[PDB]
Amino acid sequence: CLQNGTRLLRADGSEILVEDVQEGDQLLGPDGTSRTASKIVRGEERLYRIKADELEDLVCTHNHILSLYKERSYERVDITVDDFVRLPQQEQQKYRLFRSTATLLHIMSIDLEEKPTKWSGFVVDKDSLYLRHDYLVLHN
């Protein structure tokens, strides 16, 4: 469940707003093969902004699942936004967002927004992973 305005990659490569994703739309997965979106949902609530370096922030709901990498090379970890929020900061520093091109990105901040915001979400088939416009790997 992402903030409205987030741009995802379609199966061809072109962009699409997350609020415009409809039932059966073809998104792009991290392995290059296609993805089918279903069970579109909308809402409005105070979201979490994840500030990473270089890349545009990731604004999502508290129950959103992050696909991250953890140190000690790296191991693949899926963790919800709430649990990651409650993690100690020295533990949070061991996690990395990642994109498909094998680039790692440090999570530098994560905070609750001041005002509510419209958000859209869906579910994805296969490995249930899809790609943001900047090729950031996102989960259901």
Residue numbers in the entry: 1 to 72, 90 to 118, 132 to 170
Task: Give sentences copied directly from the paper behind this entry.
Structural and sequence analyses indicate that the Prp8 intein is most commonly located at an area on the surface of the Prp8 host protein responsible for binding of U2 snRNA, U6 snRNA, and intron RNA.
The fungal intein of interest here interrupts the gene encoding pre-mRNA processing factor 8 (Prp8), which is the largest, most conserved, and highly essential protein of the spliceosome responsible for mRNA splicing. The Prp8 intein belongs to the class 1 intein family. The Prp8 intein is one of the most widespread eukaryotic inteins, present in important pathogenic fungi, including Cryptococcus and Aspergillus species.
